[PDB]
Design a protein around this ligand. Structure first.
Ligand SMILES: O=c1c(O)c(-c2ccc(O)c(O)c2)oc2cc(O)cc(O)c12
Ligand SMILES: O=c1c(O)c(-c2ccc(O)c(O)c2)oc2cc(O)cc(O)c12
Ligand SMILES: O=c1c(O)c(-c2ccc(O)c(O)c2)oc2cc(O)cc(O)c12
Ligand code: NA
Length: 156
């Protein structure tokens, strides 16, 4: 079945800037986040259907994660992608989708909105430990992209 929920996060960076920065996440993320070593395109032109392989290291072991780009709407500061393989997909789960939107926040910042859709195989229930771990990783990612923009004000 599908399990859906929604979370929010804030930034002092305005949404057009932050959105443009999110497009360069493949190049930014490896620099800032210790564990992420590379992000490579396995197939596609970056738009919908593109498959990406993320290489990380946790506790000395090199692991990989597979993302698929679902859709892109630049007018509405929106990017949707799914985890479709690797360590971040648990064996009980078919797929985990992240639907992301940025909106104008108060005080010239941004509000980021995430809808998370966790698709399970059969009667299996979503893994709470993997969810908790996921939220921490997603937060980190957002802060890293924000951090880059704040630390490099001339770019964007
Ligand atoms: O699941 C993960 C993930 O998605 C990201 C991430 C990295 C770069 C990107 O450009 C992006 O969109 C996401 O980092 C991670 C780092 C970890 O140590 C463990 C994970 O499980 C993830
Ligand atoms: O709302 C959110 C959001 O949009 C993003 C995000 C991630 C990758 C992208 O490429 C992107 O454009 C946005 O991460 C988040 C992480 C959280 O812990 C909570 C959130 O609310 C978001
Ligand atoms: O379970 C979650 C999860 O996996 C991710 C996530 C986001 C971006 C990534 O690049 C990533 O690998 C994971 O965010 C979350 C954000 C929440 O607010 C709550 C969650 O439960 C998750
Ligand atoms: Na790194």
């Amino acid at each position: 079945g599908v399990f859906t929920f929604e979370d929010e996060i804030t930034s002092t960076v305005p949404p057009a800037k932050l959105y443009n920065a999110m497009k360069d996440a493949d190049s930014i993320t490896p620099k800032i986040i210790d564990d992420v070593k590379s992000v490579e395109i396995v197939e596609g032109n970056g738009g919908p259907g593109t498959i990406k392989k993320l290489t990380i290291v946790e506790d000395g072991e090199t692991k990989f994660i597979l993302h698929k780009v679902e859709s892109i709407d630049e007018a509405n500061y929106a990017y949707n992608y799914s985890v479709v393989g690797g360590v971040a997909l648990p064996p009980t789960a078919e797929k985990i989708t992240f639907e992301t939107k940025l909106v104008e926040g108060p005080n010239g910042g941004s509000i980021g909105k995430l809808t998370l859709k966790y698709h399970t195989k059969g009667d299996a229930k979503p893994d709470e430990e993997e969810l908790k771990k996921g939220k921490a990783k997603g937060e980190g990612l957002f802060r890293a992209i924000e951090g880059y923009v704040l630390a490099n004000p001339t770019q964007y």
